[PDB]
Design a protein around this ligand. Structure first.
Ligand SMILES: [Mg+2]
Lengths: 87, 44, 99, 199, 50, 48, 49
């Protein structure tokens, strides 16, 4: 549950970066991207994103690291797939 | 009239302008984006 | 079919409504928006009747009276808008005045 | 039955085969080499050229014409839009792709090594430079792949065989577009063994 | 600042002076050039430009 | 929510699809203003 | 209260700096100032940014 973002802002110390970060993470979890890191409690995706931010489980750095990992697994699978389609 | 006969050019550099044309305001949440944009410009 | 359902107002659409309202904040704006507390975001509680029920402690901010004044509600749609409303324009963030 | 006098790897024959698979119509395929082409071809085509199609009363050379005739006779699925302006632009692209880059394949193969690799560099920079194009729309200026792809994707397929490879940025969109078309089943069912060796 | 804050405080209206300061900051964005070598020597421009 | 004649319907379809995102485009009122300026003798145009 | 200090200020006794150069005067700083007899503080202002 969520009523204030004071601690979330305490983590990402901007309240303007916080919105952009939470929107990124929430669009991830909303379109078929991912699954929450904090146990969802019948919360909507934005509030889940905030609850994750508060725990220090999400920030800009975390998201970029995760994204580059995703791209690299993408490269690995895609090269293997083209190789398979060859033979 | 004056701007016409001067051929002015409006970089949009502002809040009222960016609202008129309907894009992310260069303040607040939009600020980040606009920053990044002018970095993409003045570059590749 | 869903349009026909919500026109019938079958008792399921009320459950669905309580569901899509759950965390979705809405914007309330009073007529002469003098300063930036004239627009604040709230979380809605579904309510009978036809009057918007407004917390008393925010009245002075809106410069509101319950003598006939009306307020306008807007619904932020995108995820960014909902997060802005929750983080920037939520009522529990505007306790000090920026003046 | 329609017979196609395909070249083993002739990119022209490649496109014709691709559009055939795309329309997905049965046809008596005939591989032909330009040394001793079958007697019947020389009996019908005074130019004695491949690819070349017959349809029980009609014969056509010049793969461009062939693709136009196919798309005009076998509608589903369409490969040229309705808007005459859009059609015109696609025809212009079909021509320009050829005029500019088939005459680069022709250097890298039928020219000297110096010309070959200079043109390889030129072509490489061209493709990498226009790569952002495919980065927006799925196919080459479309939402559904069309005859311009029938023209483009074959040459793109023989790129390792031309020993032309990719830089950092341009390769991204290049491979995106490739797997877009390189996965398309008609592309595969059109392929032959004579080609996969290249890639 | 003093002359408008007086009007405002006669009615008991608190305003931080930052706000009047920024309005003033906007009120004097222009400058008229005296000596030059790259400008028209006599016109009013943005003090950020000069 | 107001003006983008195409963005607004894309937004509706996204809303019913459970995906809350927006494509901005350009407000139609702005195109109208452009046309009414151009209809004076004044050539106003977007640049790039 | 809230401005930031254009230059360090000193007690009624000289060179005994009690708040350095720019330091956002919070309630603690403003109280420490009123503890002394600080008469006029220079302050960074937007009109001079
Ligand atoms: Mg009233």
């Amino acid at each position: 549950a969520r009523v204030t973002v004071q601690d979330a802002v305490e983590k990402i110390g901007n309240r303007f970066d916080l919105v952009l970060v939470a929107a990124r993470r929430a669009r991830q979890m909303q379109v078929g991207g991912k699954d929450p890191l904090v146990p969802e409690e019948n919360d909507k995706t934005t509030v889940i994103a905030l609850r994750e931010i508060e725990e220090g489980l999400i920030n800009n750095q975390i998201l970029d690291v995760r994204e580059r990992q995703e791209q690299q697994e993408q490269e690995a699978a895609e090269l293997q797939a083209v190789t398979a389609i060859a033979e | 009239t004056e701007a016409a006969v001067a051929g002015k050019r409006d970089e949009l550099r502002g809040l009222k302008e960016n609202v008129i044309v309907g894009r992310l305001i260069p303040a607040g949440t939009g600020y980040a984006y606009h920053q990044d944009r002018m970095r993409r410009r003045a570059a590749g | 079919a869903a349009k026909k359902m919500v026109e019938r107002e079958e008792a399921v659409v009320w459950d669905i409504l309580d569901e899509v309202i759950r965390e979705h904040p809405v914007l309330l704006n009073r007529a002469p928006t003098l300063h930036r507390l004239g627009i604040q975001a709230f979380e809605p509680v579904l309510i009978e009747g036809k009057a918007i029920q407004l917390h008393p402690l925010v009245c002075a901010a809106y410069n509101a009276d319950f003598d006939g004044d009306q307020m306008a509600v807007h619904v932020p749609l995108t995820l960014e808008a909902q997060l802005e409303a929750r983080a920037l324009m939520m009522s529990t963030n505007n306790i000090l005045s920026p003046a | 039955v329609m017979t196609l006098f395909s070249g083993p790897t002739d990119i022209y024959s490649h496109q014709v085969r691709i559009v055939l698979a795309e329309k997905g119509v049965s046809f008596e395929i005939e591989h032909v080499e330009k040394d001793n082409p079958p007697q019947d071809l020389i009996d019908l085509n005074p130019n004695q050229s491949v690819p070349t199609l017959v349809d029980r009363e009609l014969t056509l050379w010049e793969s461009r014409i062939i693709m136009e005739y196919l798309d005009e006779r076998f509608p589903h699925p369409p490969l040229m839009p309705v808007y005459p302006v859009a059609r015109g632009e696609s025809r212009l692209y079909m021509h320009r792709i050829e005029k500019d880059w088939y005459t680069l394949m022709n250097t890298i193969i039928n020219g000297s090594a110096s010309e070959a690799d200079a043109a390889r560099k030129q072509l490489r920079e061209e493709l990498l430079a226009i790569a952002p194009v495919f980065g927006q729309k799925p196919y080459f200026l479309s939402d559904e792949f069309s005859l311009v792809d029938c023209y483009l994707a074959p040459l793109l397929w023989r790129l390792p065989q031309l020993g032309i490879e990719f830089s950092g940025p341009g390769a991204k969109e290049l491979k995106g577009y490739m797997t877009r078309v390189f996965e398309r089943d008609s592309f595969l069912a059109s392929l032959t063994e004579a080609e996969r060796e290249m890639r | 600042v003093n002359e408008v804050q007086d009007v405002y405080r006669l009615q008991g209206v608190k305003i931080n002076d930052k706000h009047i300061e920024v309005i003033v900051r906007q009120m004097l964005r222009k400058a008229t050039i005296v000596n030059a070598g790259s400008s028209d020597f006599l016109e009013g421009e943005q003090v950020e430009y000069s | 929510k107001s003006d983008d004649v195409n963005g607004r319907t894309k937004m509706y379809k996204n809303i019913v699809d459970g995906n809350h995102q927006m494509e901005p485009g350009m407000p139609e009122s702005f195109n109208v203003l452009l046309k009414e300026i151009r209809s004076l003798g004044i050539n106003i145009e977007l640049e790039d | 209260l809230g401005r930031v200090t254009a230059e360090d200020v000193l007690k009624p006794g000289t060179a005994d700096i009690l708040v350095p150069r720019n330091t956002l005067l919070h309630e603690q700083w403003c109280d420490l100032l009123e503890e002394n007899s600080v008469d006029a503080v220079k302050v960074r202002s937007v009109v001079s940014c």
